Every structure is written in C-alpha cells, then in structure tokens.
Design an enzyme around this catalytic site. Structure first.
Site, PDB file in Angstrom:
ATOM      1  N   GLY A  18      27.110  32.237  37.581  1.00 42.21           N
ATOM      2  CA  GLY A  18      27.690  32.698  36.296  1.00 42.21           C
ATOM      3  C   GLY A  18      29.214  32.656  36.219  1.00 42.21           C
ATOM      4  O   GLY A  18      29.863  32.294  37.203  1.00 42.21           O
ATOM      5  N   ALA A  19      29.782  33.033  35.059  1.00 44.55           N
ATOM      6  CA  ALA A  19      31.254  33.043  34.828  1.00 44.55           C
ATOM      7  C   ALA A  19      31.851  34.419  34.479  1.00 44.55           C
ATOM      8  O   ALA A  19      31.243  35.239  33.798  1.00 44.55           O
ATOM      9  CB  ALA A  19      31.628  32.027  33.738  1.00 44.55           C
ATOM     10  N   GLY A  20      33.070  34.665  34.927  1.00 43.08           N
ATOM     11  CA  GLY A  20      33.742  35.906  34.561  1.00 43.08           C
ATOM     12  C   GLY A  20      35.065  35.723  33.842  1.00 43.08           C
ATOM     13  O   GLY A  20      35.170  34.901  32.927  1.00 43.08           O
ATOM     14  N   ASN A  21      36.058  36.510  34.253  1.00 43.53           N
ATOM     15  CA  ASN A  21      37.398  36.483  33.645  1.00 43.53           C
ATOM     16  C   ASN A  21      38.369  35.516  34.330  1.00 43.53           C
ATOM     17  O   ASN A  21      39.404  35.910  34.865  1.00 43.53           O
ATOM     18  CB  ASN A  21      37.994  37.896  33.526  1.00 43.53           C
ATOM     19  CG  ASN A  21      37.295  38.736  32.457  1.00 43.53           C
ATOM     20  OD1 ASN A  21      36.979  39.922  32.680  1.00 43.53           O
ATOM     21  ND2 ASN A  21      37.048  38.126  31.286  1.00 43.53           N
ATOM     22  N   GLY A  23      36.956  32.721  36.410  1.00 44.74           N
ATOM     23  CA  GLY A  23      36.280  31.970  37.476  1.00 44.74           C
ATOM     24  C   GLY A  23      34.837  31.635  37.147  1.00 44.74           C
ATOM     25  O   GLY A  23      34.201  32.303  36.333  1.00 44.74           O
ATOM     26  N   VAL A  24      34.313  30.578  37.759  1.00 42.02           N
ATOM     27  CA  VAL A  24      32.860  30.360  37.735  1.00 42.02           C
ATOM     28  C   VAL A  24      32.291  30.373  39.173  1.00 42.02           C
ATOM     29  O   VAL A  24      32.932  29.902  40.127  1.00 42.02           O
ATOM     30  CB  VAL A  24      32.449  29.119  36.922  1.00 42.02           C
ATOM     31  CG1 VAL A  24      33.038  27.852  37.517  1.00 42.02           C
ATOM     32  CG2 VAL A  24      30.959  29.013  36.833  1.00 42.02           C
ATOM     33  N   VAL A  25      31.096  30.936  39.313  1.00 31.93           N
ATOM     34  CA  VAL A  25      30.529  31.144  40.640  1.00 31.93           C
ATOM     35  C   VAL A  25      29.272  30.336  40.904  1.00 31.93           C
ATOM     36  O   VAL A  25      28.291  30.429  40.154  1.00 31.93           O
ATOM     37  CB  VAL A  25      30.331  32.641  40.930  1.00 31.93           C
ATOM     38  CG1 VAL A  25      29.900  32.850  42.351  1.00 31.93           C
ATOM     39  CG2 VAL A  25      31.629  33.327  40.789  1.00 31.93           C
ATOM     40  N   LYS A  40      33.564  30.594  44.312  1.00 28.17           N
ATOM     41  CA  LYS A  40      34.108  30.942  43.022  1.00 28.17           C
ATOM     42  C   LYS A  40      35.200  29.933  42.746  1.00 28.17           C
ATOM     43  O   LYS A  40      36.093  29.750  43.578  1.00 28.17           O
ATOM     44  CB  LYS A  40      34.610  32.389  43.051  1.00 28.17           C
ATOM     45  CG  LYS A  40      35.416  32.838  41.891  1.00 28.17           C
ATOM     46  CD  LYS A  40      35.094  34.311  41.629  1.00 28.17           C
ATOM     47  CE  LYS A  40      36.362  35.051  41.384  1.00 28.17           C
ATOM     48  NZ  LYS A  40      36.068  36.508  41.088  1.00 28.17           N
ATOM     49  N   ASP A 133      40.475  45.898  40.577  1.00 29.72           N
ATOM     50  CA  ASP A 133      39.496  45.702  39.528  1.00 29.72           C
ATOM     51  C   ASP A 133      38.056  46.229  39.883  1.00 29.72           C
ATOM     52  O   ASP A 133      37.045  45.518  39.819  1.00 29.72           O
ATOM     53  CB  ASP A 133      39.530  44.239  39.037  1.00 29.72           C
ATOM     54  CG  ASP A 133      38.878  44.076  37.657  1.00 29.72           C
ATOM     55  OD1 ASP A 133      39.000  44.996  36.817  1.00 29.72           O
ATOM     56  OD2 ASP A 133      38.208  43.049  37.409  1.00 29.72           O
ATOM     57  N   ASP A 160      49.475  37.751  40.102  1.00 29.89           N
ATOM     58  CA  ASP A 160      50.469  37.198  39.141  1.00 29.89           C
ATOM     59  C   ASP A 160      49.925  36.052  38.243  1.00 29.89           C
ATOM     60  O   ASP A 160      49.989  36.152  37.018  1.00 29.89           O
ATOM     61  CB  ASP A 160      51.775  36.758  39.840  1.00 29.89           C
ATOM     62  CG  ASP A 160      52.592  37.929  40.390  1.00 29.89           C
ATOM     63  OD1 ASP A 160      52.479  39.064  39.898  1.00 29.89           O
ATOM     64  OD2 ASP A 160      53.387  37.730  41.327  1.00 29.89           O
TER      65      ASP A 160
HETATM   66  N1  ACP Z   1      29.381  36.515  46.502  1.00 29.09           N
HETATM   67  C1  ACP Z   1      28.538  36.399  45.438  1.00 29.09           C
HETATM   68  N2  ACP Z   1      27.196  36.223  45.587  1.00 29.09           N
HETATM   69  C2  ACP Z   1      26.394  36.153  44.527  1.00 29.09           C
HETATM   70  N3  ACP Z   1      26.841  36.235  43.248  1.00 29.09           N
HETATM   71  C3  ACP Z   1      28.137  36.403  42.939  1.00 29.09           C
HETATM   72  C4  ACP Z   1      29.083  36.491  44.031  1.00 29.09           C
HETATM   73  N4  ACP Z   1      30.281  36.691  43.480  1.00 29.09           N
HETATM   74  C5  ACP Z   1      30.149  36.699  42.141  1.00 29.09           C
HETATM   75  N5  ACP Z   1      28.855  36.516  41.800  1.00 29.09           N
HETATM   76  C6  ACP Z   1      28.334  36.530  40.426  1.00 29.09           C
HETATM   77  O1  ACP Z   1      28.933  35.520  39.612  1.00 29.09           O
HETATM   78  C7  ACP Z   1      29.252  36.008  38.320  1.00 29.09           C
HETATM   79  C8  ACP Z   1      30.695  35.685  38.019  1.00 29.09           C
HETATM   80  O2  ACP Z   1      31.552  36.466  38.843  1.00 29.09           O
HETATM   81  P1  ACP Z   1      33.026  36.718  38.329  1.00 29.09           P
HETATM   82  O3  ACP Z   1      33.879  37.522  39.282  1.00 29.09           O
HETATM   83  O4  ACP Z   1      33.424  35.340  37.889  1.00 29.09           O
HETATM   84  O5  ACP Z   1      32.803  37.561  36.956  1.00 29.09           O
HETATM   85  P2  ACP Z   1      32.463  39.130  36.679  1.00 29.09           P
HETATM   86  O6  ACP Z   1      31.034  38.992  36.195  1.00 29.09           O
HETATM   87  O7  ACP Z   1      32.668  39.960  37.866  1.00 29.09           O
HETATM   88  C9  ACP Z   1      33.817  39.549  35.518  1.00 29.09           C
HETATM   89  P3  ACP Z   1      35.452  39.381  36.356  1.00 29.09           P
HETATM   90  O8  ACP Z   1      35.837  37.928  36.176  1.00 29.09           O
HETATM   91  O9  ACP Z   1      36.455  40.281  35.716  1.00 29.09           O
HETATM   92  O10 ACP Z   1      35.346  39.760  37.834  1.00 29.09           O
HETATM   93  C10 ACP Z   1      28.965  37.504  38.345  1.00 29.09           C
HETATM   94  O11 ACP Z   1      27.653  37.730  37.801  1.00 29.09           O
HETATM   95  C11 ACP Z   1      28.821  37.843  39.794  1.00 29.09           C
HETATM   96  O12 ACP Z   1      27.866  38.911  39.894  1.00 29.09           O
HETATM   97  N1  YQY Z   2      38.838  39.341  36.597  1.00 27.38           N
HETATM   98  C1  YQY Z   2      39.880  39.510  37.549  1.00 27.38           C
HETATM   99  C2  YQY Z   2      39.207  39.535  38.908  1.00 27.38           C
HETATM  100  O1  YQY Z   2      38.214  40.554  38.993  1.00 27.38           O
HETATM  101  C3  YQY Z   2      40.264  39.441  40.011  1.00 27.38           C
HETATM  102  N2  YQY Z   2      39.466  38.306  40.457  1.00 27.38           N
HETATM  103  C4  YQY Z   2      39.524  37.514  41.518  1.00 27.38           C
HETATM  104  O2  YQY Z   2      38.626  36.685  41.670  1.00 27.38           O
HETATM  105  C5  YQY Z   2      40.623  37.637  42.514  1.00 27.38           C
HETATM  106  C6  YQY Z   2      41.883  38.048  42.081  1.00 27.38           C
HETATM  107  C7  YQY Z   2      42.920  38.205  42.983  1.00 27.38           C
HETATM  108  C8  YQY Z   2      42.669  37.891  44.297  1.00 27.38           C
HETATM  109  F1  YQY Z   2      43.563  37.985  45.276  1.00 27.38           F
HETATM  110  C9  YQY Z   2      41.463  37.431  44.705  1.00 27.38           C
HETATM  111  F2  YQY Z   2      41.363  37.206  45.991  1.00 27.38           F
HETATM  112  C10 YQY Z   2      40.393  37.352  43.863  1.00 27.38           C
HETATM  113  N3  YQY Z   2      39.176  36.957  44.327  1.00 27.38           N
HETATM  114  C11 YQY Z   2      38.526  37.462  45.467  1.00 27.38           C
HETATM  115  C12 YQY Z   2      38.988  38.451  46.349  1.00 27.38           C
HETATM  116  C13 YQY Z   2      38.181  38.779  47.480  1.00 27.38           C
HETATM  117  C14 YQY Z   2      36.939  38.209  47.754  1.00 27.38           C
HETATM  118  I1  YQY Z   2      35.718  38.641  49.491  1.00 27.38           I
HETATM  119  C15 YQY Z   2      36.504  37.244  46.907  1.00 27.38           C
HETATM  120  C16 YQY Z   2      37.299  36.895  45.802  1.00 27.38           C
HETATM  121  F3  YQY Z   2      36.852  35.963  44.992  1.00 27.38           F
HETATM  122  C17 YQY Z   2      38.482  38.308  39.385  1.00 27.38           C
HETATM  123 MG    MG Z   3      33.844  39.556  39.352  1.00 29.40          MG
END
Ligand code: ACP
Ligand code: YQY
Ligand code: MG
Length: 282
Positions: A18-21, A23-25, A40, A133, A160
């Site tokens: 899925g996708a968030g704010n 990133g796509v995962v 991600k 966050d 940043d």
């Molecule tokens: N390590 C992991 N294993 C399985 N799923 C993951 C994962 N990390 C993230 N996901 C899933 O991928 C989706 C996208 O994560 P992402 O961090 O992009 O958005 P989010 O849903 O947390 C809003 P935000 O962008 O503010 O964090 C989310 O549903 C998350 O639950």
């Molecule tokens: N919507 C805003 C957020 O919630 C902040 N996000 C990040 O993915 C992120 C931001 C800063 C940072 F240093 C990271 F490492 C980040 N990613 C990150 C940090 C630690 C782990 I383990 C895995 C990760 F992907 C999404």
């Molecule tokens: Mg997230």
C-alpha cells in the site's frame, strides 16, 4: 557486511502492501540472500548530494536492534526513488487491523502499549531518536504476535525533505507542537495516547470538523478521553496521563512503564497472534 550491495534488480515484487504520506510499500524477495522484506519507495526530486546524505543517514538503522523496532536490511536509491528495506510484518499495521476489526479490545491494546513504550525507550536511550510520527499505521504486527515501531525520524534530512513536500499527520500532533514549539519527547507520548483512544473506540477520537478547525480545536479544547463505562479505569487513567496538554505535566515513558494498566497488561495471557489470525484471515 551481511548484505552490503543492495540494488533494484536483486529485488522481486510479491505484492504491494500500500501507499502512505510520500511512500509506497512492497513485499519483496531479495533474490540473492533469500530474504523476504518490506521495501518502502519514497519518491523525491533531490540533488544527488542530498540523496546520498539521506542514504548515509539511514544507515544508522543497521544499529537499531530491538524486538519492538522493525528490523532494517538496507537503504538505497534507484530510478527516482529512495528505498528503505526492512523486516516484513505479515500482520500489516494496527490501522489495517482496526479497519478489519472495528475496535481493538483493551487487552490487545495493553500489549500494544507495552511494545510501544519499550520501542520508544530503546530508540531514545540507545540512539537518541524521537519517533515523530506515532499513529496506528506506523505500529506493525505479525503472525508471531510481535508488535513493532516503524517510520521513525532517523535521518534529519529525510525529515527535512519529507516536511517541505508534505504536511502530514497534523491530527496526531501535540498541542505544543501545533503552537509552533519544536519536537519534544513529550510529543511521541501524546500521539501514543491518541492512537490508543482511536483503536479503542474505533475512530479518530475528535468531533468531526474541517481540518483547519481541528488544529485550533486541539490547541484550544481539552484532550480526548475514553468512554467511562466500557473501559477499565486503569486504561482510562493511562490514556489520560499521555494526553495532558502540558508537556511538563504529561507522563513520561518511565512513569508509564510502571503504570497499573501496564503492570496489569503484562501479567495477562493474551493470544494476540491467535486473535490477529481469526481477525485478518492469516
Ligand atoms: N515492514 C512492513 N511490513 C508490512 N507492511 C508494511 C510495512 N511497512 C509499511 N507497511 C504497510 O504499507 C502501507 C504504507 O505504509 P506507509 O508508511 O507508506 O503509510 P501509512 O499507511 O503508515 C501513512 P504514513 O505515510 O504517514 O506513514 C501501510 O499499510 C503499512 O501498514
Ligand atoms: N508520513 C511520514 C512518515 O511517517 C515518516 N516516514 C518515513 O518513512 C520516514 C521518515 C523519516 C525517516 F528518517 C525515516 F527513516 C522514515 N522511514 C523509516 C524509518 C525507520 C524504519 I525500521 C523504516 C522506515 F521506513 C513516513
Ligand atoms: Mg507509515
């Protein structure tokens, strides 16, 4: 090093998670080592200098070793996108869990609280990282019933670069941080508080209302509460301690670690793996 050279062609997609704010995962296979990971991809338009400063800042994640913190494998750049490579959680996140469950019961949330309190403590005592966050989508779970913190602000530059493209989860920000005040440890606890209330009641715990109104409401009006008949007073009290609007008076992680809700929760036998699997069809 264990892996050393990560590059797009090694990775094979199994599913989008899925996708968030920003990133796509994806659930990947890392073909060479046989590792199953979550990758991600964060799209940015950045200098190759800043793109390499981000990637170097991220490498501090190699040092993060905790059963309450999602495990890191590596970070690289390829074809327009920064990749963060991490341990894959087959429960997805609590926000996904909540959408399937409706409401997450208090006993599971006592277990959520413990892992979060312990994740945050580790990040802060070991690595001096605030999460920045905390919200249910950034709390991940698996079929082994493990509960882990992802997406914390390791890299000051990715922070940043993230900020000056996107506004984010301002609905999760503490009153003080909305008033302009610089991020504090006391802000992660507010957001933990609000997260628990939302998973408990099944929805974001404020009156509905346009975004800008919400931000003023948060600074101006009093903090959310659990309903008092359907939740223990322990859980009620725990939640209220994390949600004092004054950061000087809000409870800290130390004091939270010894709260009666947590002491009670820790001694309980909750088969959260079992619950999760009946819940989400694992
Ligand atoms: N390590 C992991 N294993 C399985 N799923 C993951 C994962 N990390 C993230 N996901 C899933 O991928 C989706 C996208 O994560 P992402 O961090 O992009 O958005 P989010 O849903 O947390 C809003 P935000 O962008 O503010 O964090 C989310 O549903 C998350 O639950
Ligand atoms: N919507 C805003 C957020 O919630 C902040 N996000 C990040 O993915 C992120 C931001 C800063 C940072 F240093 C990271 F490492 C980040 N990613 C990150 C940090 C630690 C782990 I383990 C895995 C990760 F992907 C999404
Ligand atoms: Mg997230």
């Amino acid at each position: 090093m264990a892996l050393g050279e990560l590059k797009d062609d090694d990775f094979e997609k199994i599913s989008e998670l899925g996708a968030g704010n920003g990133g796509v995962v994806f659930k990947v296979s890392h073909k060479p080592s046989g590792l199953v990971m979550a990758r991600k991809l964060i799209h940015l338009e950045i200098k190759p200098a800043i793109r390499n400063q981000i990637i170097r800042e991220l490498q501090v994640l190699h040092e993060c070793n905790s059963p309450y913190i999602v495990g890191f494998y590596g970070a690289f750049y390829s074809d327009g996108e920064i990749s963060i490579c991490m341990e894959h959680m087959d429960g997805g996140s609590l926000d996904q869990v909540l959408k399937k469950a409706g409401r997450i019961p208090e006993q599971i949330l006592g277990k959520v609280s413990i892992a979060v309190i312990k994740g945050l403590t580790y990040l802060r005592e070991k690595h001096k990282i605030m999460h920045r966050d905390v919200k249910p989508s950034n709390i991940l779970v698996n079929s082994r019933g493990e509960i882990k913190l992802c997406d914390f602000g390791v890299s000051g530059q990715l922070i940043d670069e993230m900020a000056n493209e996107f506004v984010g989860t301002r609905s999760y920000m503490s009153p003080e941080r909305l008033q302009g005040t610089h991020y504090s440890v006391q802000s992660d606890i507010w957001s933990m508080g609000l997260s628990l209330v939302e998973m408990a009641v099944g929805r974001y715990p404020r009156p509905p209302m346009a975004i800008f109104e919400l931000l003023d409401y948060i600074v101006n009006e009093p903090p959310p509460k659990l309903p008092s008949a359907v939740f223990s007073l322990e859980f009620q009290d725990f939640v209220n301690k994390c949600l004092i609007k004054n950061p000087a008076e809000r409870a800290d992680l130390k004091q939270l670690m010894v709260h009666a809700f947590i002491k009670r929760s820790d001694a309980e036998e909750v088969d959260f793996a079992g619950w999760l699997c009946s819940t989400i069809g694992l």
